Every structure is written in C-alpha cells, then in structure tokens.
From a paper:
Ser/Thr protein phosphatase 1 (PP1) forms a large nuclear holoenzyme (with PNUTS, WDR82, and Tox4) whose emerging role is to regulate transcription. The PP1 nuclear targeting subunit (PNUTS, also known as PPP1R10/p99/FB19/CAT53), which is one of the most abundant regulatory proteins of PP1 in the nucleus, has emerged as an essential regulator of gene expression. Tox4 is predicted to be a largely unstructured member of the DNA-binding high-mobility group box protein family, which has been reported to restrict RNAPII pause release and early elongation, promote late elongation, and facilitate transcriptional reinitiation.
PNUTS adopts a nine α-helical bundle structure consistent with the PNUTSTND solution structures; its structure is most similar to the IWS1/Spn1 protein (DALI Z scores = 13.4–13.8).42 PNUTS helices 5–9 form the TFIIS N-terminal domain (TND), which is a conserved scaffold enriched in transcription factors that mediates binding with TND-interacting motifs (TIMs) and is the domain that exhibits the greatest overlap with IWS1. This domain has previously been shown to bind directly to the MYC TIM (34VQPYF38) in addition to TIMs from other transcription factors (including SPT6 and PAF1).34 Helices 1–4, which pack tightly against the TFIIS domain to form a single compact fold, adopt a distinct α-helical bundle that is not present in other known TFIIS TND-containing proteins. The Tox4CTD adopts a novel conformation, where aa 571–596 form a zinc binding loop in which Tox4 residues Cys572, Cys577, Cys592, and Cys596 coordinate a zinc ion, while residues 597–612 form a long α helix (the Tox4 PNUTS binding helix). The binding interface between Tox4 and PNUTS is extensive, with the Tox4 PNUTS binding helix interacting with PNUTS α helices α1 and α3 via hydrophobic and ionic interactions. The hydrophobic interactions are toward the center of the Tox4-PNUTS interface. Finally, consistent with its nanomolar binding affinity, the complex buries 2,100 Å2 of solvent-accessible surface area. Finally, subsequent isothermal titration calorimetry (ITC) experiments showed that Tox4CTD and PNUTSTND bind tightly, with a KD = 0.3 ± 0.1 nM.
Residue numbers in the entry:
A (entry chain A): 2 to 147
B (entry chain B): 568 to 620
Write the structure that this text describes.
Amino acid sequence: GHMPIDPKELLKGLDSFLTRDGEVKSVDGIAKIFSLMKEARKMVSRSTYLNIILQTRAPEVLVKFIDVGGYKLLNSWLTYSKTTNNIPLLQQILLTLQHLPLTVDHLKQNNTAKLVKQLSKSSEDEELRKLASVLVSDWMAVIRSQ
Amino acid sequence: GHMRCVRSGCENPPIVSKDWDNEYCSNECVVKHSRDVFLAWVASRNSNTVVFV
Ligand SMILES: [Cl-]
Ligand SMILES: [Cl-]
Ligand SMILES: [Cl-]
Ligand SMILES: [Cl-]
Ligand code: NA
Ligand SMILES: [Zn+2]
Ligand SMILES: [Zn+2]
C-alpha cells in the first residue's frame, strides 16, 4: 500500500545529470530535476533534491533553477514545513535559499522573505532563528546594493 | 523496514507520519539519513581502494 523512498535509487536515476560530487552539470539537467521536484511530496525526496541544489555551484545553473519556478516551489515547501513545524526541513530550505543567488526581483515574487523574517523573530529553535537572522541581513544588503 | 528507524545508528521504532512511510522515527533522522546516503553515493563515484565491492 506504500513504498518508502529510496534516496540511493533517486540519485542513481540522476546519474547522467550529476557530476561525481552531485552537482547539476547543465541547464538542461536542472530543468528535468525541477520537473521531478515539483512532483516530490515525500520528505525524503525533498531533502535529497535540496542536497543536489546545495552542492551545485555554477551560477548559471542556479539562476535557471530560479527561473523555471524553483523559487515558487521552495515557497510551497517552506509554507508546508512552517505549518507542520518541520524544523530540520525548514533549516535545509533556508540553507538552500541562502545558497541561491536571489535578486531583488526574486524576493518580490512571493512571501518567502516575509516568512523568513518572521522566523528570525519568533522561532523557538536557536539554529533556525540564527540562520533566518543571517538570511534577512544578507537580503537587506542586496536591497541596499541598488 | 518497519522495526527500527532506517537511519544507521538509530534503533528507535519508526513513527507514523504523512511525510514518509513508517520507516523514520523523527524529522531529523530523515535529513541525516538522506545526507548519509548522499555522501556514500558521492564516495561510490570517486576513487576507491578496491576495484569491486
Ligand atoms: Cl514496505
Ligand atoms: Cl515523493
Ligand atoms: Cl506541499
Ligand atoms: Cl526532529
Ligand atoms: Na513565486
Ligand atoms: Zn511497508
Ligand atoms: Zn531515527
């Protein structure tokens, strides 16, 4: 009646799109990965795909993830993790947001910046509150750059 | 399995959650186990001290 997510088989299915260190190679690969992420509802699948984004360092690949709808998707995961009070996934999501080269136009798309600002003030987790505080200060500097 | 948390080093019984399938004891073990599998997957694609496992 169910099937536990196998994170090893998830990475194995993406063998051709990733390097030996788990980084997305091209902008064509990040489009197919985003299509899989949009259908990922189990926590194991989401946490595994977030590790792939965190390991990817090419800015042109990270910007493509934002353009195809990855910033809207992370907002939906952030909203669900905040409602269900999933601290470990909230931590990993905010680490991904800090890893992504977000611009001012990206931050104006949804209420992610608002939810992160609220976490920096009222979160009872010490590491999540500190990460949200550093994330807000970084976004304050991005707005101040123009 | 369903007898213990699938994360290596955790012997706790799994709990029921709509976010997995009765094989994790907590949210932290989900993130830690996925990180363990990711690192082992990277190690399996890098240089090895033996040809076959
Ligand atoms: Cl099963
Ligand atoms: Cl899924
Ligand atoms: Cl959701
Ligand atoms: Cl937890
Ligand atoms: Na959006
Ligand atoms: Zn089962
Ligand atoms: Zn556990």
